[model samples]
Target: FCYSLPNAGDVIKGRVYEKDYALYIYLFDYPHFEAILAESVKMHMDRYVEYRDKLVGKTVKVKVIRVDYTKGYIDVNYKRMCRHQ
Candidate 1:
């Protein structure tokens, strides 16, 4: 099945590549999914800047229990880490 940012609200395995000055987190998982979902759905993150600094270069396993479709957001917990530093 094809995945998308809309369908990104689920427990997903991902790898973090780097963190830029603006906290541009390059995630392999979403980019890969986006590649597969090209033309069908558009993945947009208007506020990735706000929280990107908190997660740059940190590989995180997530558990998404709820989704906010209107905001393109999801309620997620970092499963790999009990707490973040």
Candidate 2:
């Protein structure tokens, strides 16, 4: 399991595998890693419903909000990322 974890503020392109109210789970195929949407980032249902509804099984771009090397996990955010990011 020699994996290079992404750093904070890194832009990642991946496929969303799961979706929930507080998290969007994704698999980064390039380097083969799993990441989750951070629950700390406040989101409005009205503004995020469309994004959330289509996330599952869709390709998305996200900005790394935090990276926990000790836990071997990464937290990402789409709300703060533009489509071109």
Candidate 3:
């Protein structure tokens, strides 16, 4: 009897966690939801050399690219930010 609220084409903040053949991201709102997905090929960048572990345990901004609420599956793309540099 619970409802989930998430919309496609929306940008959200999350932390990185690598698994399987892709990278998974999660937020504090629903710490249990692991649908936040992003892979090397889908990253639109050539910096993902050999599934680098450096990306793991980091924070990132993601834009929802695909969503399948039926299976709690959501795909996201990385949003670049370099103002701190």
Candidate 4:
């Protein structure tokens, strides 16, 4: 399938499509078919550029915290994905 609607807490594979004020991570599947996003708060703001550079072109997994059907956004986190492991 092109896009799959992942449930909350689901670990999904994504890549850093781009970044600005927020990291625009791209998922293989989702309800709306768009960016799976994260921010410095969810990552490390101290080494912000490093974290941003680390993810760009590097395949990463993010935890789905929430999904907004209205905007068709899948709220995701990078550091949160490392938990319980």
**Per-model C-alpha RMSD:** 9.6, 4.1, 3.8, 5.1
Q: After superposition, how far is residue 46 of candidate 2 from its true place, in Å?
A: 3.6
In candidate 3, which residue pairs clash? none
Residue 31 lDDT in candidate 2? 47
Mind giving the per-residue lDDT tens digits that candidate 4 earns over 1-85?
2435678888887666565566767675652455656555455666767866666665667888887766676778774332222
As a TM-score, model 4 comes out at 0.68
Preferred candidate (lDDT higher): 2 or 3: 3
Query: Which residue pairs in model 1 clash with each other?
Result: none
The candidate that wins on TM-score is: 4
How many residue pairs clash per model? 0, 0, 0, 3
Candidates in order have lDDT scores of: 0.40, 0.62, 0.63, 0.64
- Model 3 clash count equals 0
What global local distance difference test value does model 4 have? 0.64
Candidate 1 TM-score, C-alpha based: 0.36
On lDDT, who's better, 2 or 4? 4
Query: Clashing residue pairs, candidate 2?
Result: none
Name model 3 segments beyond 4 Å from true.
39-46, 50-54, 81-85
Give the Å error, residue 68, model 3. 1.2
TM-scores of the candidates are: 0.36, 0.62, 0.68, 0.68
Cα distance off (Å), candidate 3, residue 67: 1.3
Count clashing residue pairs in model 1: 0
Candidate 4 residue runs with Cα over 4 Å from true position: 1-4, 41-46, 79-85
**Which digits, one per residue and each the tens of the lDDT, describe model 2 over residues 1-85?**
4557776787777766554455565645434344777742366766556656656566677788776666666778764433533
- The parts of candidate 1 lying over 4 Å away from their true place are 1-9, 15-56, 81-85
| Per-residue lDDT value at 70 in model 2 | 62
